[model samples]
Target: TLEELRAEARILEAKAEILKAKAEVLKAKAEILKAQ
Candidate 1:
């Protein structure tokens, strides 16, 4: 189930991270307000 691996940042094994690496899945979105 390759599609089963499609989630978010978690593991470091690199087993299909080729598609899950730098996507950051909703990381910012004006995060400056929260960081301040």
Candidate 2:
């Protein structure tokens, strides 16, 4: 049961990481506009 909980926690962490990456990518696009 603890292993299962750990697996779920890992999944949540992965989701958070992806969300962060997406936000970073969006900001990068903004930077491109500023460059232009």
Candidate 3:
């Protein structure tokens, strides 16, 4: 049961990373628009 919980936690961490990357992209685009 401990191992299973660790696996589940890893999946959640991966998803969080993906979301963080997407936020960075959106932020960059906003900066570009603001510059114009």
The top-ranked prediction according to TM-score is 3
Q: Candidate 2, residues 1-36: lDDT per residue as tens digits? A: 799999999899899998899999999999999999
Candidate 1 runs further than 4 Å off: 1-29
User: For every model shown, what is its TM-score relative to the native structure?
Assistant: 0.18, 0.77, 0.83
The collision pairs in model 3 are none
Q: For model 1, how does the per-residue alpha-carbon lDDT over 1-36 read when each residue is reduced to its tens digit? A: 455454332354565666564454445634765898
lDDT for 19 in candidate 1 is: 51
Ranking by lDDT, best first? 3, 2, 1
Flag regions of model 2 displaced more than 4 Å: none
lDDT of 3 by residue, 1-36 (tens): 798999999888899998899999999999999999
Order of quality (TM-score): 3, 2, 1
Q: What lDDT is reached at residue 14 by model 3?
A: 96
Better of 1 and 3 by TM-score: 3
Cα distance off (Å), candidate 2, residue 11: 1.0
